[PDB]
Design a protein around this ligand. Structure first.
Ligand SMILES: OC[C@@H]1O[C@H](O)[C@H](O)[C@H]1O
Ligand SMILES: [Ca+2]
Length: 306
């Protein structure tokens, strides 16, 4: 195995795709390996609203730029895709619409518009938030399925249910598991099982002075306490300080590359890669919702002598 490093260093791709005509951005990526291919769902923004989409399955990252971009006719903003092995079904979890978070199911997750009708997955609210719950992820161990989310408010939230109950509405309850400034625990929480390392990894997007960046935390169990791993802007999990990305100062909402598509959200720490959203650092400010986000890929450096 390969331990997660003390100090992260990455190289970056160029932007991996441009939005198709009529869209301004591609955002909030979720990726699974599927039949030897990359399967990516994402949010998009057009001139006026958010929606969701998938890319046609593609073998190589080089392929992403020409993959077909298909909008979902019932939006599934900020999606999470995985296979739930105890039901033999694929899940797509997302925000807004009929409930704060919803789930939908499929036997073939590549059917962009083939998912079941959305059902409530979470019906809670939280305090001191202008957005409410956003940016969920879902992850399980052998005992429970957990929902983690954020709220643009400096807090990370968690709820859970017994594994044998999933899927169902988690309900209204949630607990604060991490609390800091709004900037430090802002958006885009993700949680993973670290293969061969007997631990769990969380990343959370923060607003830095130089751009968006990710902060990492580790825990010994999904119901355990999270402790910071790489939390400063100058020595982050991933950010301008260590991304190797020349084109973007932001390293923002996406997904680590998972080694298998199931509910454990497993990553291979020997092949650590981040599918992120970035934006041209030289494009003058405009509204956030019109920001020209694009996919990018970070790949961790190999070990070296220095
Ligand atoms: O893309 C819509 C929202 O903005 C941010 O990318 C956030 O993470 C997501 O909820
Ligand atoms: Ca997400």
């Amino acid at each position: 195995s390969c331990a997660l490093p003390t100090t992260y260093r990455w190289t970056s791709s160029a932007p991996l795709a441009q939005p198709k005509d009529g869209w301004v951005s591609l955002k909030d990526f979720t990726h699974v390996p599927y039949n030897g291919q990359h399967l990516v769902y994402a949010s998009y923004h057009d001139s006026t609203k958010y929606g969701s989409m998938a890319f046609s399955p593609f073998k190589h990252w080089a392929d992403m730029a020409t993959a077909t971009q298909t909008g979902m006719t019932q939006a599934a903003v900020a999606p999470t895709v995985f296979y739930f092995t105890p039901k033999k079904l694929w899940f797509l979890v997302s925000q807004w619409g009929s409930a704060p978070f919803t789930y939908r199911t499929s036997t073939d997750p590549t059917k962009v518009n083939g998912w079941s009708a959305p059902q409530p997955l979470f019906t809670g609210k939280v305090a001191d938030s202008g957005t409410g719950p956003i940016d969920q992820t879902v992850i399980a161990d052998d005992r429970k399925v957990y929902l983690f989310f954020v709220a643009d408010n400096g807090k990370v939230y968690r709820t859970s249910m017994a594994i044998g109950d999933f899927p169902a509405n988690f309900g209204t309850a949630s607990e604060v598991i991490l609390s800091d400034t709004q900037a430090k625990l802002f958006e885009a929480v993700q949680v993973y099982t670290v293969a061969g390392q007997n631990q769990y990894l969380m990343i959370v997007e923060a607003q830095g002075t130089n751009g968006r960046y990710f902060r990492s935390f580790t825990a010994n169990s999904l119901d355990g306490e999270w402790k910071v791993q790489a939390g400063s802007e100058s020595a982050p999990f991933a950010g301008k300080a260590n991304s190797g990305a020349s084109w973007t100062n932001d390293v923002s909402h996406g997904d680590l590359i998972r080694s298998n598509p199931d509910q454990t959200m497993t990553i291979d720490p020997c092949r650590l890669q981040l599918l992120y959203q970035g934006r041209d650092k030289n494009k003058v400010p405009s509204s956030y919702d019109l920001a020209p986000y694009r996919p990018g890929l970070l790949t961790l450096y190999g070990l070296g002598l220095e």
